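Worked example 3. Consider a protein that binds G27.
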Amino acid sequence: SVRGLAGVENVTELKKNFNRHLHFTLVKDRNVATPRDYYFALAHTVRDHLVGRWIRTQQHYYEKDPKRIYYLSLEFYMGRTLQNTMVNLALENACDEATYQLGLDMEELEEIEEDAGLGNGGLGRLAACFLDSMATLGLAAYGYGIRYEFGIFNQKICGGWQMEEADDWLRYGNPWEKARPEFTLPVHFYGRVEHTSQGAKWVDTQVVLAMPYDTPVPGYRNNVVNTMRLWSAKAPNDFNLGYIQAVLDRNLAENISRVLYPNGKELRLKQEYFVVAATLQDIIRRFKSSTNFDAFPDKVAIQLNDTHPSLAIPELMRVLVDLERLDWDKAWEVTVKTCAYTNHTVLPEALERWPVHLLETLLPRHLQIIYEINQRFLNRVAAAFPGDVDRLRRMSLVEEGAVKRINMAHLCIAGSHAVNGVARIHSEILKKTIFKDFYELEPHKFQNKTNGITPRRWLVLCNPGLAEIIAERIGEEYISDLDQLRKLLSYVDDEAFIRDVAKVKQENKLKFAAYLEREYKVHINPNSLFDVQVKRIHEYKRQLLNCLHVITLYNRIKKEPNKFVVPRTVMIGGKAAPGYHMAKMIIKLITAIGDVVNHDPVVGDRLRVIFLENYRVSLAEKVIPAADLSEQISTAGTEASGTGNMKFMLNGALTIGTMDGANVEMAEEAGEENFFIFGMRVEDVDRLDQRGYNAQEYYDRIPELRQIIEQLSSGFFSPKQPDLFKDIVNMLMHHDRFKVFADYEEYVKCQERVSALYKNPREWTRMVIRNIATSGKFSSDRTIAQYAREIWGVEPSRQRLPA
Amino acid sequence: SVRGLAGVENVTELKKNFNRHLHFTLVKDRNVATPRDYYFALAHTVRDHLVGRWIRTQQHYYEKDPKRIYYLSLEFYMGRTLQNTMVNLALENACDEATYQLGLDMEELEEIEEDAGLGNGGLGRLAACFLDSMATLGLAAYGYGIRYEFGIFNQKICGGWQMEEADDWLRYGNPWEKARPEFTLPVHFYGRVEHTSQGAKWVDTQVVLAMPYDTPVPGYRNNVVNTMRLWSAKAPNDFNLGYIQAVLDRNLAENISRVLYPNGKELRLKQEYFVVAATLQDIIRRFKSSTNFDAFPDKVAIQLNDTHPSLAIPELMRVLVDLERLDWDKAWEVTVKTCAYTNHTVLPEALERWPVHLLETLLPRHLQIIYEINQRFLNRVAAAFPGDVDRLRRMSLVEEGAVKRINMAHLCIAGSHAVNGVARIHSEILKKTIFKDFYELEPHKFQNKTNGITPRRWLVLCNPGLAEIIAERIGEEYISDLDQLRKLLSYVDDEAFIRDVAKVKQENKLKFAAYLEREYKVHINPNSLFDVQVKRIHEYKRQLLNCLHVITLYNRIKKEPNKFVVPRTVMIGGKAAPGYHMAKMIIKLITAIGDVVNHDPVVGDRLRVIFLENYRVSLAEKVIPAADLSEQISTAGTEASGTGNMKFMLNGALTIGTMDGANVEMAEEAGEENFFIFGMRVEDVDRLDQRGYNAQEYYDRIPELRQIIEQLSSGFFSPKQPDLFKDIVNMLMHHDRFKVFADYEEYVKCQERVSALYKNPREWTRMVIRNIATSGKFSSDRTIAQYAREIWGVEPSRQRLPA
Ligand SMILES: OC[C@H]1CN(CCCc2ccccc2)C[C@@H](O)[C@@H]1O
Ligand SMILES: OC[C@H]1CN(CCCc2ccccc2)C[C@@H](O)[C@@H]1O
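Given these inputs, the predicted complex is written out as structure tokens:
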């Protein structure tokens, strides 16, 4: 029903276009076609329905000439496109019927599509949700990035160890993209700066070509189709031009767009400048086709997703000053009013600081511009806070020391009219700590825009069962207006609704339990509580704290085997960065625990530990609707927002978490009685750091914790390699930056409360209903409406374009 | 008229499919579309008409299960595909009308298509003509090769010097190919040989993937559409699997299909094995889908185009012996009956001899097989010619010496049931000289198959004006039965026909003269005799002899300025191999002569020297119909056949040439009175070599020749670099392998006879008519019918498949 109408004319028309594409496009007959061929024929049929809208949307923007939004990101974690396109075009039921009549299962065909895995995690998925919301809200918005030939690696688990393999996502082709080789642009590297009578000139550069590929981004049932433009690196035709080697060395230039970096390398800097330089030429071209750059900020907004595209600031200055001949002060005025910066973390290991010698060689003109920006900026600090010499060194874009570095975050703050964090607590921490000096100089710049997720992909698409039972009571309006879910509060005592919510969850769990047996040959009890933590493997996300709880349960079972315990399936998934040794050790630990627990006859089906292999958007869409418990247990102050948390909330899971990131706002919206909050607050973490964190203290005073550490050390979980986990124990005991032991007791206690509530199915489900009903604020439609009004200066619209 | 019907239903249907493709396929509206977009929309519309026939042709072969022909070549010089497809499908007039009604010029759109330049010259063009003829003759034939990312380089002339640039022919895409990533095959390199109880095993190999791309090859109006399958190199997904570098090093494997070699490097050997290994797996798969390999030669013919795919012989043995477990003698019987080899030249510099140490490392199992082939072969020689020890060393596949080499030609003769040359004189030279020993052992193996050209591309397509005036008198049957052109003999005294032939030539010359002004800003007299030599720049093709004639004419004009001479436009074109210094010097000489001649006021428009830049198939289609005189002046015994010669003959040019290659058969067919033959015969060249060639003798006895040499030496043609041409003069005087001076006198004399005949337009044209009328034998339909009956053991057919 939420999947639209299956009209007689539409079903007939889809069937014939399907057959046309199979014959003419794929060059196949029905007798030689594989499931893959059928997928492609379907993909091309659905794609056809986009193009008319795509052309008229871009035609519409040319006529109306609205302010254009440029969202610059090095990551767009798109996942699969087929189902999303059907949903947004109201084609899902029609295609389902059309394929059924051809003797095909549409769900089977959907599984053939590769994830577009052009992101690592939350940052890349946020960009993807944002594109969806911008189209749904009728904004003239463009996503700009890089078309990586290889996305995030596929994770294979071999002997409990992560193995990486190339994600060759383009092998069979991408039906969604359109190459635009006609709009290829030159990008310059290296060379030197020459000063003449008429200003500076950047000369003797190497040229790399930037070739755009456009992907359509459909809005939800409004006939708006926006563009995601991704640049591909091409060598010029006179490149290096014995002969054979010159042709083979073209690879060097084209390596720029070859691979997405996981997580100061020259290739990464090249990628960062490549996307920025090509994108800005496009922006200016489009602006000139509307001399007078005073109107530039009225027609252009550039959003810098993290500091990765921060070179947009000195690149824009370069173009305005060196090429368009504007004076410095006017160019700077235009730059600041055009650009805005989103910070994504306070963790020092993630902050970009480029060695000066790199910029010197690669982008000599940009370094000069950065120096000049810094000088003028520091003069302003000096005048506002006279004599405060330490403030000057703290605020400088140039970090002095062993190697000189440029702080890209400081560059972004200076060159932007708005700086935002991604959840209220994160945004406050920014103003109180790392950007305190900048906030004191320019308080007006600093904002919050709490993250969100798209309810199209993260409810309608992945959980149609839940979307439907909601639509039955309150209609379909909530899909583009998620605040309407509040209406579900008046159904909290409705015995029919309670039964339906719980039924949808059980079906999801049954479906996922089947998926596990079929594609991974693993057997789980679908009646157990589905306890899931899925996200990148990092020490701050504290997968290890989860591991300690799992082992505690196992040790409690072995101690009192004939005592009753609420059965659990504990699922942990996520990728470790290839060079991150500790993260790789944690994965090994998780599998090692499973090896012991899953094969202990005394445990039975009361406890299972499963490591979810190759976590990615398409896997998320399967496991999230099946979850009962969402683990969001980062040390308070470390997780800027989180977005997985919101996905679980929308899909009927209860949350055990710390007061970190968006968890704080989630608990505020639902009421803290409907959340399982535990552990230190930010203030408690601060107190512990001042006093000094001593892990040994917890080890000495908690016998259950001591036993686990002794088990890890002695080789209980690694019988043939007794010291395998020495690194983990050492880290926990002596250099734990994230205070795992400090939250252990309260975590285990809170987990007991979870189990207690699960014993009462009716009251569990009523609490679930109170969560789903208050999850409205965490729609990316809300987030994007806030960016539009408070940063970009444009009004969202829900009005249809003509079909 | 020869361009088919323009029906009301067809024109209407083409127009709507054109618009569909522009909208849905290209994602453009009429207001943003460029000529390139229109070309692509047309290309896709025409392509649609192929697929139905393509699918049913391959379906037809599956049912009827005929003997399959595999033509293995490292070069396929296809040129443009659009017009050729229209011609063979009878769509040319219909598309012309359909585009006219859309407000488009179809000829303009045709110029946008890039040449598929996957060949160097005659060898690659021969393969292309052959594919056309095989489809036209209804043979179940497949062309197999490599999809080079970069074809033959684009030639730029800068300051009279050749510059090479990458031929990025795939930049805008190739509408004609269909990627078949589903039929990807593994190819092995390196590793080592292991001997077990159950035979040899090739282990520890590196794997490169071979991905096929299929291109349709339509027959002439018979609804047959055959396949050209070209392999692309892909790295496996666990390749080298810090992380980033492993992904970037995938380039190394994929370099195999990156670039076509011009003209013993490891990359070239890899290309040669790559095409062979992937192709043979395909051949065997298709054969198994018809255990019993006795029937293999009844169902499979493999034609080795030159020695480049010669590894097919030991690869086939490897598969049959190591994998299928056949005994050596039976496998060898199957191999010999399956394979046939075409030799393309007797020139030693072109013969492939691979260092043993290369094969040792790259293909260790193949080396073992080659040694075993040699041993068994030499035992057979020893038994046939007992005690003849020098014969044994001469015939060995293994050449001993400083470095040990494998002679790939000797390998091909031993492993093939048929060996052919490419013109009668060439085939005789093979038996008399380089393969004399092999001919004495197995006389039955040795054949001739004189080359041919396709009358579709080389008459109908490039010279519609001539095709039409011929069709007016004798009908359209000759297009697929070129012997019918003999009927034109009865029109040699027909005043109407004479006028028409001459009119078509003048129009072609006017059209080409306009092309030169527009695309190259050069001005020529269209009334002058168009004297043209187009082909690869090589010393044996004797472009230098042409240069000496040009200078002689210039010196004769300057001597008697007010004397009347027949005006000439001398056009020379062709590419020099990048590392071939002498060839590059000859190009410079040609331009240097033009610089002097074209700007001498005394000369006027009586003599022009033009160097035709970037010679290629599409340029050939323009200049050949415009030519009056075809220069085919290789030293007798060096040009195996030539095919350009035949193109010129078919298109109304008279030929000045030596008795070399197919020139001998061309003069035989037309009668020698209708050809301008001059110079030494093969026997005369032999006599001169025995005596010793002394260039000085000619210099001393011919004052006109002396003057030219003195002009070159003194710096007449290079005023600012007086010694620029020292290398050329030195070579001519002291180490001329091709005896340029020896043919000078007779050449200049013969050129005078040409000029005399040109003064009498009526008698020139009557001789032209006698040439065109006897050009029938040089159709590749004839050549291929001979291969089919005499080598492959199959019957050609002109019967239509159902439409
Ligand atoms: O804003 C999107 C997400 C962005 N991420 C950025 C994580 C950055 C990071 C990267 C490597 C190591 C530590 C941290 C944090 C989440 O809390 C947010 O929800
Ligand atoms: O058979 C096709 C052509 C094949 N070519 C092969 C030329 C090979 C060669 C390549 C480099 C240097 C010298 C010779 C010779 C022509 O006479 C033939 O017509």
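Take a moment to read the result before moving on. The two ends of chain B are 21 Å apart (CA to CA). Chain B touches chain A through 52 residues (CB under 8 Å).
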